[model samples]
Target: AKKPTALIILDGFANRESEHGNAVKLANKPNFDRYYNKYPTTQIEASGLDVGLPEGQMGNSEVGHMNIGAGRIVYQSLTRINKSIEDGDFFENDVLNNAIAHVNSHDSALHIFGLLSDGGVHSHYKHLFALLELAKKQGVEKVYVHAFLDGRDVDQKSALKYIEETEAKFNELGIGQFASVSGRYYAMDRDKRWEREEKAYNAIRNFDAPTYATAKEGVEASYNEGLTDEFVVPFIVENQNDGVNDGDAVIFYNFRPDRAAQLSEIFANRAFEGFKVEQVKDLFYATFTKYNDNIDAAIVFEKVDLNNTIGEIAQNNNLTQLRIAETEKYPHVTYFMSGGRNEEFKGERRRLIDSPKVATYDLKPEMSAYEVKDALLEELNKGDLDLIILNFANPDMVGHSGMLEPTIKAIEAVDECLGEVVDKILDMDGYAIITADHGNSDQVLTDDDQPMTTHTTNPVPVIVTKEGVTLRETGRLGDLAPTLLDLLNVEQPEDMTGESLIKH
Candidate 1:
């Protein structure tokens, strides 16, 4: 039996970058620092690139990870897809045209679902507007927006501002439509799943059925819990009381589809099955957006009519698609975590314990400190592997709570666990790599010096460990992956955009 190489990805590691304008300073990560002292760490610079620009712009996770895995950076999906549309390359495409046409044909409400924030971190507000404008230009009317609060990616308290801005935009355009806000805390599940705190928050927050104005004032001043799950749907559905009707069409407007897939699938299937699973196509497409001519996308489009209902007859085939329905009750799951759960084996996950068997640590929302530590220790004891990917939902979770003290404690707990993980790795003669996906911790302070729960633009830290690994002072989150592959003596794919930190 051979030792498996390991990979650890701390989601939202970049949060500190945005919160404090410098992620390393706020991280308080002594264990990570120790790893740097024991080994050589290199810093890499990353930025998004404009395809047409003489020098491409800085990059994001999609570009960063692709470059790391493939060993080089190719043109990003966003630019390529946007170009296709601008060039009329998609004009004749039946699938897209049909969908557009169907959207235009009805008095149906066009529902656009996505994260509403000014962070420019992931989905830009302008891009969302462009999509809506395109639909409107195509003759669609009566638009309805379902906005997911982005306190983790942006300030939790500023949710109202974003909501107000969105409404103002629609109003200014004189569009006969409105977008609604749903708080991520109330709508999304935490680890311990929908525990007591979540329920209590919802009971108080939702006591008065959240409307745009209430959510705006409520989200900015205090914490509210009635925003998670499909909480937005109830506001519209129950509006049967207020003369609001079901929308004609629903589209999850997020470019990053992984988080929304589970919810979308539920809507698409009209069922809330206990265990959630996405098709391989959805999973593959989740990493790569349809910004180009890649036939490998998990999801694709075909021609259809704008007036088409979810279960309407296919204009071309005259076949009936199942009519989409709204569920009467959407159960709240306590432990709400959403990401790429079905990771493929580009390599095996190895450990320092016996047999290196893959283990699943069942994490739920509100997991106590003891629970998290116990699980990590258990995994450490069963070691015989090459790599381990550990995720701590605490920092991001507590950050959403907008409590500076709690968030600080969460960061400390994560730091302690990280120290323990590094110790175990060193004892086993292994190397360690520490990095995050994106920033979420910067700009957490308000005018009053309070913690603002939101994602930040600060750069995250990359600290690696191994006796001979040389440290390079670099910038950019994308370089973390390729550098790791380089340390493991793996061949980095040529199509990737990032370079390894190791100097040969």
Candidate 2:
């Protein structure tokens, strides 16, 4: 039985096309180029179109890692929520109905908040529109939209387009108002970064920051200041009515959980001291869906559990494993990559190096990749594990910032790290596999030279360097688990739907 030493999931490494053509083809990635040219490489679908979301929806880190760890097509939150909407299940949910009823009975505004883009990774603008229509139909007037601008999951500086789209819909609906606007970085935060969350809260509560005449003006101003939309300083809509009022019914509409969880606490928990929310007194708060099952909330679908997964199987077979990545992407390699389990199983080791606490990724384009490389090399030298799983978040995180030179540097950093890892793996007589969860860095710039921050439908590359391994013509993200199991001489689980690319 032949076994590989490690599996590396480069967060946003993929085949991408911009105005200049494929990104990897243009970047100076000698190590990546060497493996891609000399070894077996295959492309796999990682976007929502093929990875079990609505068709045409691109891939995201959450669902990407979910599919990779599960070794099968697990319907993600976006797909399930969309299906619920299609089947009229969402409109009839008690939580939504209660909020509408409260707004109607109290004669108060219904406040909706979320990312304003069709990124399909988080709450889509279409979903927000549908909810507004539903609120209008149910006798709720004066609906207020507090939109969070997105550049991380959509074209940079393109917030105006979505804002206009929402405004047009509001005019047609004749019942909604734009209350406030902030960058998604502040509103939708993870890693317990409360200061960022505080800026978002202040924009809506105090309305003390710069006030924009229109969302278009706000977005343009952000670009003029050389800032990406996602990090634009929070602002209030001047000449617009007051921010969310007491007795208002508020809905946090992002379907993705990690980033939404903190905001949910701010709205729902009075005891939460992460920040202060003094504007609203008594309010009805609801999330489009519960971000975490552990948190009590209004309306949530059943979560998929893939705990009995590839990692667990390997653990049961007495294999030692170590997982490593920075805080920004630690979960992708450990939790999502290990089939949704947050806790490490017996004999499995994990390390999460702290990511830089900077506000924007482009500020430090070479984010933690060198530190990650050092960690991996140290672990390899220990030679105490049967398998090692790692994720390099540079390309994805920096790519999302939509900075071209920085994004290219991010890719090169990964390439340099890859060179060192491959050399060490070869030295130890071990095998290596390099692949990505999805694509973002490869297409940093759009046709007009603006930063394009959205994930692409382009297939991610999978490279394997092993003695007796054969590559498949094509594959999907889900196939990696079973393929890895095959290489490790472990029996593939029956529930895993992915095929082993190697001809074992």
Candidate 3:
């Protein structure tokens, strides 16, 4: 048995193509090209239907990293919740029923806030619509929607479409009204960006930004200001309408935890004052699912903990591991990638480089890639790390900004950084595997050659740089941890279902 030097995970680097061809195929990625041509490579499934979610769902950082680190197909929150809805269990969900009851018994408005998209990442607009219908059926009137627009997970500037659809549905149900609207960037921010969160809170609580007679007017104004719907300034739909009042039952409908957790904390904690905003008082607040296990709330299901995760096993086996990424995606490598573990394993190291505080990512296309790479190099030079997991947030973050030129630059920047990593690995006579959690930049353009800002269901590439070794079979994201364990000559736990791609 032999041990390989390290395992590296590229956060959002995936192989993808549009009608013409793939972005990686067209981009000038010399280092990626060199590795692809020189090393034994294989494609892996990293998307929704492929990774145990519903068919046709695109992969996100959350589930992709979970599967990669868990070494098995762990049914994600999206899958479990969607199944609950399909199985009619959602209507009967105890938490939802209680919230509805509270709203009904108190004669208060049921305020629903969430990312309004079928993006299948943070949430699906259909879930909001279903809940509206359910509220109507349950005889709870005065439902108000606080929609957070999504340009990152769906088409850029597509918020208008979803808003229109939601409005039509609301009209059809003869209930529910638009209370406020803001982009997901401000409302759904994961990092503790107080400024961004303040904007959303103001719009919903005080009608602070601007007032629009209708959502159509607001979307048009957003475009006029040269901002996508998601990045548009927060606005109240009707100026005369008072914002969310007392006795209102608010529901944070986003199923994912990373972004939703921030607002959840604000809503739940009375003593917490991370941001100065009008305090939400005398309201029953709930979430679709408990974003954090520590947050006290009624939720749909408990999150899974893969007890013997790759990082945990590595630490137990006396292997020193290092995890590094920017604040925006640091948790993907540490928390989600470690199969729901929040803290570092004893004797393991993790670094979270602060991301740029800019409002838009395209403003700085090569976001913290160079910094992260430099930090990784510094740690590598220390010569104490057995496994180094690195996540370059450039391609995904910049790609989500919906700017073509910057996204290309983002990909190239990652290529240059990876070149350094590969050189160091070869110089050290060590083994390394370069793979992505999912695809984002690879399919930047749509069929009509317009820029799109969502993840692709395309397969991500796994390029292995091991001496005299090759991966012969096609693999999925779940196979990565097992393969790494095999290369390290560590025993693969029986609970890990993924087979190693490395031919023995």
Candidate 4:
């Protein structure tokens, strides 16, 4: 009989040491240090071409889990969209042309909305510029932009700079200007926080937020009051009929679905009950990527099916599986790790633990680690589940806070929880595959000693703790599922191309 197995993905755990002010190195994480060194460890590429972003782009949580679950490298939506743009297909697409035609025929304004950042994680400013250029070429007159400020992916307090640069493009092309400015904190929520979502909806649809003469002035005022870019109060451009009206053509440009899905439902879903949306009738909605299958929007790019994932493999083999994570990473451990499937398999169970509801993670760096640990321990005690997978979202979430001390504390909390869970699994004659999705808290500070708020290009460590087994020195996140199946003696399809790391 095969032994029980567990896979623990320390989401955003990094491998860099303390020389560069790395939080994972600076922390007192004896459990992590010993398990990492004592086991059969290898380094794996988590970013750039490996998990399928553009070359040298940092690893994000979505593609990281997709790679792990698919047992092969899954090209990200960013990569697909970039390829479409390069092949000149994006310019000649039917969806975008239809949206433009609808606006032109109806004499309605064309509205562009999404994250405003050069960061390619969710979106890029170049993509927005390209769309603006197309509108100008099509001889469209009315256009407005609903800008969501990003401080998590890009630098903190850099909103003003991005706004200034985008304004220069507007002057050069003379197409559109910002209609509303709201922080991503309010508009990009995925945690089912409808009250906050309603706030964002009001600002974009009804112009119920504070009014400002210009976006620059409103952002400056928010910063003056000690609020950073991500927390700026929602404001509308003064004396403009900029809010969404019936029959207008609107487009959401964020390619990633995690944060964009909830916001899309407000405008795209026919059965949305999140809040009062003021019922803008007969709106022509377009999305850059498919947020969800039921979202009634014309998608510029469609979703790719990552078939034969680890979750499907478990179901076919009649293995009972459990997945656990806090609210911050529940989507990652479930949907992302299941190859974008929204529902669970027959033998799969998903457990949710509430993440701290604070304004930010640094305020409470522990971030419900103890609660997750206890939940995992309870399952391990059951001793009946064949496979268990979990994601501890500490290093990545707190690392985004850009606070060194808090990040260090967060790593220690993760280390302790990891120690308890791994120990329990081992005591029950189970094996654990300990690895990280990507790097974040490892090197917290940049070379110039500035707080680096984005994901890093560092390789993460993969440690396998099964007896009589040794791992190769090089591997990837895609190898995780193959190796897992190998450990369980389950047959993998030939299409799942990731090579197992275990020495047979």
- The reply for model 4, stretches above 4 Å from the true place, is 26-39, 53-63, 74-79, 103-116, 119-122, 133-248, 254-283, 289-296, 302-305, 325-332, 340-342, 350-383, 391-430, 444-456, 466-472, 494-497
What tens-digit string does per-residue lDDT give for candidate 2 at 72-124?
88787777777778899888878888988888888988888899998877888
Worst 10 residues of 4 by lDDT: 12-21
- Mind giving the per-residue lDDT tens digits that candidate 4 earns over 1-504? 235788899888867745576887788989978887787888888998887778988898988998999999888777777777778888888999899999999898898988999777788877888789888988889889888999888998899988998888888998898888888888888898877777777777745788888889999999999998888778887864467887899888898888888878888888888876656787899999878876889988887787789999899999999999999999999999999889999889888999999987999898998999999888777767888889999999999887899999998999999999898877777788988889988877878888888788889988888766788888788899999998888998987899888987
**TM-score per candidate, chains pooled:** 0.48, 0.65, 0.66, 0.69
Model 2 CA deviation exceeding 4 Å by range: 1-3, 17-23, 28-30, 52-58, 87-122, 125-286, 291-296, 326-328, 339-341, 352-371, 397-413, 426-429, 448-455, 467-469
Best by lDDT: 4
lDDT of 3 by residue, 212-263 (tens): 9887788798899899967977888885346677777887889888999887
Give stretches of model 3 more than 4 Å off.
Answer: 10-40, 51-64, 73-80, 103-109, 114-123, 136-248, 255-282, 289-306, 324-336, 340-342, 350-386, 390-430, 439-457, 465-472
Candidate 1, residues 255-370, lDDT tens digits: the string is 55434443444334334342342322111121113322322222323211112111111212222111000110000000000011122232323112111122211122222433
Ten residues in sequence with the least summed lDDT for candidate 2: 16-25
Tell me how many clashing residue pairs each candidate has.
89, 1, 0, 0
- RMSD to native for every prediction? 14.2, 6.8, 6.6, 6.1
> Local distance difference test, per candidate?
0.43, 0.80, 0.80, 0.86
